[PDB]
Design a protein around this ligand. Structure first.
Ligand SMILES: C[C@@H]1C[C@H]2[C@@H]3C[C@H](F)C4=CC(=O)C=C[C@]4(C)[C@@]3(F)[C@@H](O)C[C@]2(C)[C@@]1(OC(=O)c1ccco1)C(=O)SCF
Ligand SMILES: C[C@@H]1C[C@H]2[C@@H]3C[C@H](F)C4=CC(=O)C=C[C@]4(C)[C@@]3(F)[C@@H](O)C[C@]2(C)[C@@]1(OC(=O)c1ccco1)C(=O)SCF
Lengths: 9, 241, 243, 9
């Protein structure tokens, strides 16, 4: 799940 | 003047989000669920912004940060929901979508809502203060791990132990050990609540015959998490055996 | 490691989200229109600053009348400083993501005349190359940079809170040549009194002017009314880092 | 100024 990795960076 | 870990949890607590429910169109169980899923997605986005601000959390390995959110989102949603409803007999999904006595009686409605009502009544019963709620909610983020362990297991352990102590402190600043027992006993019972809620959630997601829509934020999590309940790679952390 | 949070990291979370101006892009620009739109923005910026101050540890423990005095004395410092920061992070003036005073708008009548002062703050932050954490301590101290002549009612607690944030800025500096940068950054703080004097002079003069037709929201109007006597009598004491 | 007093309370 790429969207989650994003919001966490 | 020195800021406490609890005063910091207060600050980072996100704004309560509106559901965007049209109050001029007849209610139905399809319309409510679909709207709530959409809300759920935005609430998850919020929870990420919230977790990132919990001291320690951003210091975990990124995969661990992800795992914990994927495992606990329902705990965090259900528990916040309990709190919102507790602070209102009803369920406060949002200031624009309160399940009143009227909406409760709709087809298949109370069937699920009984589980979310349970959380709400336990908080009332135990008469939980805000600062306890905030510590409890933080522990819920830390309530399941992969059976195999996390990558930064050592640090996670320290973080969890800190918020246990923190919950403990909140109780003191509010019969103290008894209350500590009671509130951890509640946290334990969140596992059961979440299992129920996730079962119908996954069951609906997978059902083709129901036209219930899920936002992508949720759909990705749900997709990623299906196998881990199918292969049983989740360890539920409990305070009482 | 530090799972107990520094006072700076708290200020980092309490920092209010940046507010939009609502300025219409189809309607032609005017000095009249920009100033009013800016006054309205100013009002909502003050309401945000109240919520912000209350979250500062110790602040909510002062006398309520003191809490009032501090916000009444320092609103312009806080607004101008945050403006200087926004302008630095994006020489232009970022009042809002939707109202940036650019090169062309600057050339509007009576515009750069006031904007020069606000630009000064912005070019100091770029000069001294101020970091974010330094910024958050400096702004906090700006809340605590003026007091009435015969002190506050909780002067002791105030003195202690101020002393705390002086130390907090000192940590920001080291965590980034030490004592000279301290001098530098505290000299900038000192020099805000001179900026704010100018900005308040034009603000009050416009506020009181009959034939000028520039609107003010109530939030600001109560404070401007509540302060004009105080500043034109001399009950304000400007706390300086360097004499 | 009551509004400020209110927002502070
Ligand atoms: C039973 C599931 C679980 C529901 C979520 C519960 C969660 F606590 C939550 C809280 C909110 O404030 C907003 C949304 C969620 C995340 C949630 F309510 C919704 O997504 C809907 C979920 C998945 C669920 O709810 C119902 O049955 C339900 C709620 C009210 C009536 O029925 C669904 O499975 S909806 C269909 F999949
Ligand atoms: C010269 C004054 C000072 C202006 C305020 C400065 C402050 F930094 C600020 C920042 C904002 O983000 C939004 C509003 C304020 C609080 C402010 F810009 C406005 O109220 C307008 C103030 C009082 C001021 O500005 C101008 O003339 C001005 C802005 C651009 C060009 O001139 C006024 O006095 S407006 C007329 F009363």
């Amino acid at each position: 799940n790429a969207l989650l990795r994003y919001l966490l960076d | 003047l020195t800021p406490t870990l609890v005063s910091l949890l207060e600050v980072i607590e996100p704004e309560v989000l509106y559901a965007g429910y049209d109050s001029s169109v007849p209610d139905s169980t399809w319309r409510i669920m679909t709207t709530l899923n959409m809300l759920g997605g935005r609430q998850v986005i919020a929870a990420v912004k919230w977790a990132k601000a919990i001291p320690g959390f951003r210091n975990l390995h990124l995969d661990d940060q992800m795992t914990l959110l994927q495992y606990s989102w329902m705990y965090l949603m259900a528990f916040a929901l309990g709190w919102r409803s507790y602070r209102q007999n009803l369920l406060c999904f949002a200031p624009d979508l309160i399940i009143n006595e009227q909406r409760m009686t709709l087809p298949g409605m109370y069937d699920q809502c009984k589980h979310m009502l349970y959380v709400s009544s336990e908080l009332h019963r135990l008469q939980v203060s805000y600062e306890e709620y905030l510590c409890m909610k933080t522990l819920l983020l830390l309530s399941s791990v992969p059976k195999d362990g996390l990558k930064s297991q050592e640090l996670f352990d320290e973080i969890r132990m800190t918020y246990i102590k923190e919950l403990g402190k909140a109780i003191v600043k509010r019969q103290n050990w008894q209350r500590f027992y009671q509130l951890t006993k509640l946290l334990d019972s969140m596992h059961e609540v979440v299992e129920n809620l996730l079962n119908y959630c996954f069951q609906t997601f997978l059902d083709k015959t129901m036209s219930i829509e899920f936002p992508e934020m949720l759909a990705e999590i749900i997709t990623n998490q299906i196998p881990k309940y199918s292969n049983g790679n989740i360890k539920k952390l409990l305070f009482h055996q």
